[PDB]
């Protein structure tokens, strides 16, 4: 059994769950083998799992596929360095914090022969299994997203926009490509909420907020209106399963061309035009 | 917007079927579960009621009928129901003849309904695999051998029937196969069945199902390429809700999410294999 080398950068919330996923058995991980992981910190070893250098792991011909699994502000860094070194790129989103920088990483995985790939398990999770069959039929009248937390870091997370960019993924997923109308910012220091606003290509109106302070319990509120009727709620609808295991399964698909131009391209625009936009919005 | 869901058959299937629907998920959400349909007098199973298949076939009401009784009646309810007007999911195999399947399929085409044969084996994690190692290769040889404990033929069928996953995943890895040769011994209580078919390219696959008592249900594999080998799939962890994704796949048809590409290349497919199945019972 023929298996890619990958090490985890960055051993955070985001970089135990994928350790944790490629030491379990699975589908997808029967592909991979974890050599290793790189922190700034001196861990020495998670799970039998060897800490090692960044320098060593560039070096590694062993070490063919890199999961950067850092603080936002870092990724673009990394996977230059990954890409550069000659290694498949796994990266959790946002990818980069500017629109320049995900098209010059884009190209440079082409120029060298390598995937690159934003992990959007937003689109794995049930809630929005759900809302992709309800708006299946449907054209929206009107319709808004609040999305609440906890502080965030922004020098090291960036700004709102590009870190819950999940919730940006949902509506241009659900609706299309969207143009920005306009979008307001208040900040006091340790709060801030940030309301934007959308149209879809047929000119209707989508609204969305993020809210982050101390005291607010991580939620999400949603509504939407169309000519047949209104959604106010999404249901129960179960809890979410293993959305990076599933993530980590595309990106092996990827690794072994299971999916088309057509698709790859699809999915670089879509990405591209959210990057942008989280882009747009920090400007205005 | 719930679509009204009777289930037919309280056995395993109809039970995995039953909390599925109770429970809390994307799919579900789209379903309402009306009552269910015993041959035996149950009374109530989760505060779900009983109710007569007389009364399930006229309820406006119900609109979706899931078939998860013995293979040997599936036929006759498929017919009743998709007669009644109602959209059909039912458990492999959808029936135990070629030119009943395409009678039944034509019968949907025509009263405007879904028709559904789920397909579970499918959506294994040991399939999800195999999908990915088969992807880039050229097959030499190959076999696959599945054992289990003995099965009433009277009422789950032939066992290329009752075994048509195991063709299923033949075809889905290999393509359209062809039959060139199929023994069968007994021994009234054992069963051995080595049939031997080929790939388009014309590769030898061998397919044994083995059912006798104390035989521990199992499976084994082995695939030779040019370019090397497979002789075990590896612990690939075990199966999550390979039922509740094959109702989702339902509930996309329900709502036209797949294409007329897509939809007949499944068709094409159903058929393919319980023809197989015929020919194999035959020979
Ligand atoms: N985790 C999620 O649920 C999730 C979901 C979607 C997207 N993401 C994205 O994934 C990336 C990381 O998010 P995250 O939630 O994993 O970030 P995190 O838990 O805050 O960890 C980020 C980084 O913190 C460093 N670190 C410093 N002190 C640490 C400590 N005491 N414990 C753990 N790590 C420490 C690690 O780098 P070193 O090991 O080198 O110090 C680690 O890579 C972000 O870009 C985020 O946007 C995360
Ligand atoms: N088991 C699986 O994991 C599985 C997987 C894929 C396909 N299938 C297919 O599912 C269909 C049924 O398979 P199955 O495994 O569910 O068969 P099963 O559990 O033996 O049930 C079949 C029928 O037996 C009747 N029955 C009579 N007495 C019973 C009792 N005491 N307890 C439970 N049921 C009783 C039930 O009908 P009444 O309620 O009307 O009495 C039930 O619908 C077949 O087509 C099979 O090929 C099963």
């Not at 850092?70 to 550069?84: M, V």
Request: proline share 3%.
């Amino acid at each position: 059994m023929r298996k890619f080398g990958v090490v985890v950068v960055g051993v955070g919330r985001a970089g135990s769950v994928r350790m944790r996923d490629l030491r379990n058995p699975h589908p997808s991980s029967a592909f991979l083998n974890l050599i290793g992981f790189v922190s700034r910190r001196e861990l020495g070893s998670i799970d039998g799992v060897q800490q090692i250098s960044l320098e060593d792991a560039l070096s590694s011909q062993e070490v063919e596929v890199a999961y950067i699994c850092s603080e936002s502000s870092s990724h673009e860094d990394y996977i230059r360095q990954f890409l550069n070194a000659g290694k498949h790129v796994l990266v959790e989103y946002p990818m980069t914090l500017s629109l320049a920088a995900a098209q010059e990483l884009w190209e440079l995985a082409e120029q060298k022969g390598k995937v690159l790939h934003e992990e959007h398990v937003e689109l794995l999770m049930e809630e929005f299994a759900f809302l992709k069959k309800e708006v299946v039929g449907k054209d929206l009248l009107k319709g808004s997203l609040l999305f609440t937390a906890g502080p965030l870091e922004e020098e090291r997370f960036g700004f709102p926009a590009f870190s819950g960019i999940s919730r940006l993924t949902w509506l241009v997923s659900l609706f299309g490509e969207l143009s920005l109308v306009s979008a307001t910012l208040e900040e006091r220091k340790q709060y801030m909420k940030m309301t934007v606003c959308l149209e879809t290509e047929k000119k209707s109106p989508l609204s969305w907020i993020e809210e982050k302070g101390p005291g607010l319990k991580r939620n999400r509120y949603l509504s939407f209106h169309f000519k047949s009727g209104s959604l106010e709620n999404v249901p129960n609808v179960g809890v979410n399963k293993n959305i990076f295991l599933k993530d980590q399964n595309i990106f092996v698909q990827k690794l072994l061309g299971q999916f088309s131009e057509k698709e790859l391209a699809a999915e670089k625009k879509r990405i591209l035009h959210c990057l942008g936009l989280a882009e747009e919005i920090q400007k205005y």
